[PDB]
Design a protein around this ligand. Structure first.
Ligand SMILES: Nc1ncnc2c1ncn2[C@@H]1O[C@H](COP(=O)(O)OP(=O)(O)OP(O)(O)=S)[C@@H](O)[C@H]1O
Ligand SMILES: [Mg+2]
Ligand SMILES: [Zn+2]
Lengths: 670, 166, 91, 48
């Protein structure tokens, strides 16, 4: 009748037939009608055979990994049971799926009589990587009956071990007759031959294992800090160990947010090194099957920071994607949206729809997200287009909401608070690993946020010693550590977004701007944009803000703004493909603006005088504005907009040049 | 949170900002701040004295015209109230907006005077909305009424201004 | 009712660790058949336990079948079946 | 003050193919000889 693997409900023949029928007959319209998306169905994408075309392009590029969405299995009628079998029994079902992929690979070239050779396909090993296997349940909510099941976990990578050689074939040689054999590992156990296999030599205990002749596989252990969707009462964040093997080794860097799907494993741990006695309480971990580093809600990583990592990814053939793919239709949409005359206001308005107005603040945040162009000298110098923003403001001005939004939108930033962080915790430290009892180096908040935005709330409350770490980060985008364990230069290419209050917790018009900000000039000069966010009471402004806040609570789930997915992919495309350059007309405008504001600083501290870092900030903001409009050159109007944003951020029009005071009524428009 | 003024005893000579050693950002986070003044009087102290002596003598509460709700019964009623998810309509939103505008203008007027209790912020508006939703939750209603908003407003007003005026 | 019953509550109170296993034995002795049939949405532990129960039944049936195939006496049907189940559950 | 851990087994899979030199197969062949041998018309060793 029906043959079933013991301990499962899995039939090999039934699973192969169901999965092969799924591969031959699945269309994405089934996924659309599963997700109750009928109006979004289009013929040209959905009607074509999805897994057939992925198999075809997988043959054409020579790749061996297939990414399988498990939700698609639940979409198809015949493979509804196969979805539950894949979740419950991944070890057998995944092997069955690999065999079925290889069968479809040979069948596609035999059936269509293609010129591809069968021997080259047969020698390759094909493996499938399932993902989106279910909801990201809490890791601590899993039970022992969930062992050896497929799970999803969202997490932040803290650190990874070096590559570990895991023995797969053992090489033995006879000491007397130099007779060699190779034995393949079986479930973690290698059987030493007690005697020589050759008929001539039969010396007992004569086979010695040669450690360098025998073959190994790559194994890496990564500490992942889980960020589950649901957190119960009084739960603190935890770190789990996840094991990656073979091509997935070194795919994940410290400080990036990933979707891990893998099997939930448990092993007994030896109580002592010399003893073979094991502990009854098991240690749990995840054997990783697939890693997703791309989210549609947030931006992708800056590829200028991972160029060599992309090269090593191509060498290792891991086939893990750091960046989302841009199709032709959505690229055409990007080019059409970039042609809009209201592009700046549309992009800034779509930053934080929940936050009302703060137009110039949103414009500065958008320019920080875009960034200036990155210039690397052939001699060895390096310029980074990272924009640092300070938001000094009165209470209840939604700047913490702005920092929260930026923390959600960035690929790998870190959110920190004033006096909740130390100088050591920002850069790097040494911890004792639980598994190995070894001292290991672990990155601090600034190094983890490299390639992203480090948001610092309550920046006014930070200690001066903790503040003084940020100088090298803001100016050189690096930290030069000389400590007992580490003496090296670490890249921290993190744009800093800080939020702060005045001394009296509210802005005092009697005091000048510098006293209200209360930052040392070396620190405050390194900020590209300083925003004085003020609360002016008006009839129309308060009425509009109150209406905007009350429209949120009309319904349980709450102009025209771009969607967050299109916003993220547009900023991603502009950062990846646009590297604007300064022209002569921009150069003369930059020089004239810097000279003019230096002349304004000549008048009699009370005021923030112009300094060369403001010229650098003008260059960076002009490059960011040019990158926004997809232009490959920085011309005069980009520099004018950068200068205008710098003037409006500090409210230089409102303040009096001589006194340095700000009067609320006579110029300010809320 | 429970606190004392800066001098330990409240004095009417100083501003209520002055003798409250609390920054404006931390002040704005508190949805309700109750000034609780110990003002001696012949009639109000006698009621307190008879209440406390009755509690010390019969080990229980004086007034026999009402029965206190047991803490477990209160806990389950509050749990059923917390299950509710009220929403606001157009009329209560308009009334809340007008109240917030009046509060902001009144605070701007009081800023120069000693009567000031701070500056009204959007956090004050959100606290009013939050209190109205809590009062709607107590009535186990899926909507917020005018009367709940007025009760929230009167709680906010008698929290600080009313006792300091007396 | 008037019938004599041991103090089970007190005996459980003094020696509960034994009575856990006694209650488990009593429950396993009188376990109703499942009205539902096992599908692919059941737990892995449930299908493992179902396969173990089916295996136990199959070994019992195979043992009694081959012992009947022996016919080692060529000889009371019900007493024969009682001795048969006695030897099969012991082997 | 706990009791012994207990060790027990149950046959599940077929295992490796039987070998003639294995003790269990020799015992099975001896058992078959005892049960099934016929001298003239009788099971002489079974009856004995
Ligand atoms: N301009 C605004 N747009 C939208 N919502 C706002 C605005 N200003 C205040 N709010 C609301 O008021 C709340 C107050 O929180 P925040 O303004 O983020 O606090 P804050 O601005 O960081 O000021 P602090 O904490 O005293 S430094 C926000 O969560 C919003 O719900
Ligand atoms: Mg804040
Ligand atoms: Zn040898």
């Amino acid at each position: 009748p029906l043959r079933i693997i013991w301990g499962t409900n899995v039939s090999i023949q039934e699973c192969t037939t169901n999965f092969r029928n799924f591969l031959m007959s699945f269309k994405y319209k089934f996924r659309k009608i599963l997700d109750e998306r009928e109006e979004f169905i289009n013929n040209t994408t959905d009607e074509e055979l999805y897994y057939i075309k992925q198999l075809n392009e997988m043959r054409e590029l020579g790749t061996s990994n297939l990414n399988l969405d498990a939700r698609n299995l639940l979409a198809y009628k015949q493979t509804e049971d196969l979805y539950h079998q894949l979740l419950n029994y991944p070890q057998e079902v995944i092997s069955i799926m690999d065999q079925t992929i290889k069968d479809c690979m040979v069948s596609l070239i035999v059936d269509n009589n293609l010129d591809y050779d069968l021997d080259e396909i047969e020698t390759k090993f094909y493996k499938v990587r399932p993902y989106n296997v279910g909801s990201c349940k809490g890791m601590r909510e899993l039970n022992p009956n969930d062992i050896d099941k497929l799970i999803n976990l969202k997490g932040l990578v803290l650190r990874s071990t070096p590559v570990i050689p895991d023995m797969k074939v053992a090489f033995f040689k006879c000491n007397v007759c130099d007779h060699t054999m190779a034995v393949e590992i079986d479930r973690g156990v290698i059987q030493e031959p007690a005697r020589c296999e050759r008929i001539d030599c039969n010396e007992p205990n004569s086979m010695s294992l040669i450690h360098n002749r025998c073959s190994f596989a790559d194994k890496q252990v990564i500490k992942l800090q889980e960020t589950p969707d649901f957190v119960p009462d009084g739960q603190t964040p935890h770190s789990i160990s996840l094991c990656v093997y073979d091509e997935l080794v070194d795919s994940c860097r410290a400080g990036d947010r990933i979707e891990v799907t893998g099997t939930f494993r448990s092993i007994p741990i030896r109580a002592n090194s010399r003893q073979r006695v094991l502990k009854s309480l098991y240690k749990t971990y995840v054997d990783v099957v697939h890693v997703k580093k791309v989210s549609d809600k947030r931006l992708d990583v800056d590829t200028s920071t991972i160029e060599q990592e992309l090269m090593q990814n191509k060498v290792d053939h891991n086939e893990v994607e750091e960046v989302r793919q841009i199709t032709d239709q959505d690229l055409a949409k990007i080019r059409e949206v970039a042609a809009r005359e209201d592009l700046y206001s549309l992009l800034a308005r779509s930053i934080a729809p929940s936050i009302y107005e703060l137009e110039d603040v949103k414009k500065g945040i958008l320019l920080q997200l875009f960034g200036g162009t990155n210039k690397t000298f052939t001699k060895g110098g390096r310029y980074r287009g990272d924009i640092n923003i300070l938001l000094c403001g009165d209470p209840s001005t939604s700047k913490s909401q702005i920092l929260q939004y930026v923390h959600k939108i960035t690929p790998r930033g870190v959110y920190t608070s004033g006096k909740g962080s130390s100088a050591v915790g920002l850069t790097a430290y040494i911890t004792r690993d639980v598994d190995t009892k070894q001292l290991v180096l672990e990155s601090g908040a600034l190094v983890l946020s490299d390639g992203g935005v480090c948001c610092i709330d309550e920046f006014d409350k930070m200690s001066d010693s903790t503040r003084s770490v940020l100088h090298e980060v803001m100016e050189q985008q690096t930290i030069s550590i000389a400590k007992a364990g580490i003496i090296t230069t670490l890249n921290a290419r993190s744009s800093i977004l800080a939020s702060a209050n005045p001394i009296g917790s509210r802005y005092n018009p009697n005091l000048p701007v510098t006293e209200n900000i209360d930052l040392p000039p070396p620190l405050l000069s390194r900020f590209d944009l300083v925003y004085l966010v003020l609360d002016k009471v008006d009839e129309k402004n308060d009425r509009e803000l109150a209406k905007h806040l009350t429209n949120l609570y009309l319904e349980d789930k709450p102009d025209d703004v771009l969607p967050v997915e299109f916003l993220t992919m547009y900023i991603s495309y502009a950062k990846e493909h646009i590297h604007p350059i300064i022209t002569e007309a921009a150069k003369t405008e930059l020089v004239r603006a810097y000279v003019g504001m230096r002349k304004m600083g000549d008048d009699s501290e009370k005021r923030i005088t112009a300094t060369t870092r403001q010229l650098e900030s003008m260059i960076r903001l002009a490059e960011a504005h040019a990158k926004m409009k997809l232009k490959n050159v920085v011309e005069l109007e980009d520099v004018q907009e950068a200068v205008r944003l710098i003037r409006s951020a500090i409210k230089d029009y409102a303040t009096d040049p001589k006194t340095g005071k700000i009067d609320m009524n006579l110029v300010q428009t809320g | 949170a429970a606190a004392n003024p800066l001098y330990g005893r409240y004095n009417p000579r100083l501003s209520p900002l002055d003798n409250i050693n609390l920054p404006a950002a931390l002040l704005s986070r508190f949805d309700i701040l109750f000034l609780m003044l110990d003002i001696p009087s012949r009639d109000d102290d006698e009621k307190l004295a008879e209440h406390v002596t009755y509690v010390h003598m019969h080990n229980k509460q004086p007034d026999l015209d009402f029965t206190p709700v047991e803490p477990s019964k209160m806990r389950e009623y509050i749990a059923y109230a917390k299950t509710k998810r009220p929403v606001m309509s157009e009329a209560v939103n308009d009334y809340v907006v007008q109240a917030y505008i009046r509060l902001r203008q009144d605070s701007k007027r009081e800023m120069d005077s000693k009567f000031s209790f701070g500056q009204a912020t959007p956090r004050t508006l959100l606290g009013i909305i939050r209190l109205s939703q809590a009062l709607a939750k107590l009535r186990l209603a899926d909507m917020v009424d005018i009367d709940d908003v007025e009760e929230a407003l009167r709680l906010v007003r008698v929290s600080k201004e009313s006792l300091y005026q007396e | 009712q008037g019938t004599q019953a041991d103090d089970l509550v007190s005996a459980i109170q003094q020696n509960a660790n034994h009575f856990t296993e006694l209650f488990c034995r009593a429950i396993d002795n009188n376990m109703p058949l499942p009205t539902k049939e096992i599908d692919y949405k059941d737990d892995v532990l449930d299908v493992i336990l179902n396969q173990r129960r089916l295996r136990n039944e199959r070994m019992l049936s195979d043992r009694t079948n081959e012992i009947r195939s022996e016919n080692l006496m060529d000889t009371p049907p019900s007493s024969m079946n009682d001795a048969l189940r006695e030897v099969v559950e012991d082997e | 003050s706990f009791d012994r851990p207990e060790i027990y087994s149950a046959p599940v899979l077929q295992g490796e193919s039987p070998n003639d030199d294995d003790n269990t197969e020799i015992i099975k062949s001896f058992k078959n000889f005892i049960l099934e041998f016929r001298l003239d018309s009788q099971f002489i060793y079974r009856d004995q």
